[PDB]
Symmetry: C2
C-alpha cells in the first residue's frame, strides 16, 4: 500500500520548500495531502506564490495518521505552524506512534514550539539556528540533511531536493529514491 504524506501549508511558507517535497514525493508514488493550516482557501507563500491546498488541515487530520508529517519552512510559515494547537496535536500523535517527522529551514522551530523530539540532532537554516537552539533542547548539525530518532531536518531552498529524497528513502527505500533522482537532473 502506498505511503502517505501530510504537508502542512501555512501563510508565509517558503513555496520552494513546499513544492519541491510535494512534487518529488509524488514522483515516488507517495500519496501527498497538501493541507491548509487556515482552511481550504489558497495560501499566500513567502514570495507571493499562491498555492491552493488539497484540503483543510481540519479535514486532513481526520484522515490520519500519515507515514510522514512535513513542515516546510519560511520564517512566517513556521511561526504560524508554531502557534497552531492543531499542528501540536498532529505532531504529538506522530511522535507517539514513532512516525517520521520532517522539517526544513525554519520549519524545525515548530518542533521546538511543540516540544517534539527533544534530545535529537537537528539542522535548520543557518539564520534559524539560534531560535532552534534556545534552551539547548536539541543538538545542532550543519549537515545539509540530518536524521536522528524520528526527526528528519534540512536547511533551506537549496537543500530541498536532498530533504525530499531523504523522505523518499525513509518511506520507499533507497532504490526508489535513486530512480526518482535521475530524471531531476540534479548535480
Amino acid at each position: 500500500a502506498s505511503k502517505r504524506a501530510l504537508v502542512i501549508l501555512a501563510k508565509g511558507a517558503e513555496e520552494m520548500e513546499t513544492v519541491i517535497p510535494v512534487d518529488v514525493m509524488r514522483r515516488a508514488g507517495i500519496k501527498v495531502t497538501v493541507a491548509g493550516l487556515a482552511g481550504k482557501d489558497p495560501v499566500q507563500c513567502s514570495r507571493d506564490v499562491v498555492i491552493c491546498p488539497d484540503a483543510s488541515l481540519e479535514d486532513a487530520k481526520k484522515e490520519g495518521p500519515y507515514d510522514v508529517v512535513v513542515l516546510p519552512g519560511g520564517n512566517l510559515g513556521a511561526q504560524n505552524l508554531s502557534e497552531s494547537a492543531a499542528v501540536k496535536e498532529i505532531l504529538k500523535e506522530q511522535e507517539n506512534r514513532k512516525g517520521l517527522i520532517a522539517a526544513i529551514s525554519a520549519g524545525p522551530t515548530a518542533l521546538l514550539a511543540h516540544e517534539i523530539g527533544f534530545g535529537s540532532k537537528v539542522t535548520t537554516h543557518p539564520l534559524a539556528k539560534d531560535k532552534m537552539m534556545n534552551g539547548g533542547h536539541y543538538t545542532y548539525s550543519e549537515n545539509r540533511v540530518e536524521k536522528d530518532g524520528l526527526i528528519l531536518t534540512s536547511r533551506g531552498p537549496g537543500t530541498s531536493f536532498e530533504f525530499a529524497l531523504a523522505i523518499v528513502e525513509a518511506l520507499n527505500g533507497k532504490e526508489v529514491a535513486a530512480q526518482v533522482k535521475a530524471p531531476l537532473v540534479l548535480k
Copy 2:
C-alpha cells in the same frame, strides 16, 4: 527601475520549474508576473500542485514588454505553450526587441514550435533533446544552463536554481545573483 519578468503558466507545467524561478527572481527584486495561459483561474501543474496566477496572460501581455519571458517546462505544459498563438506573439515580440527569453526542461520545445532563436545553442531536459533537435535548427548543449544570443536554457528541476540565478545575473548583474544565492543554502 526594477526589471520585470513574465512567467507563462500552463496546465501541466513542472511546478518546481515554475516556483523556483519565480521565488528566486523575487528575491532579486525583479517584479514577476505569473500569467495564466488559459485565463485567471488556478492552474493544475504536472504533479498536481495548484498555483493561482497573478493575472491572465491576456491581461499580462498588455502590460509588456518584459525584461525576460520565462517558459517553465513539464511536457504537457510545454505542449500547451507550443500550441498558443498568444505565446507565439509574445515570444516574437521579445525576440524582435532583443529581450531575454528563458526556457527550462521541455520549455525550449516551445521555442522550436514558434520558430524562435534558430541557430542558437540550447540545452533541454535529456528526454526532450530529440524533440528540440527535430530539423537541426538549434545546436545542442549538455551544459546545465546554456546561453546563446537571446536564448537562456536549462535542463530540469535539479537545474532550476542555476537557471533562475542565470536570469538574475543577466538582468541585475553578478553581484546581485551572488547575494541572492547565499541564503538559499545551495551546494
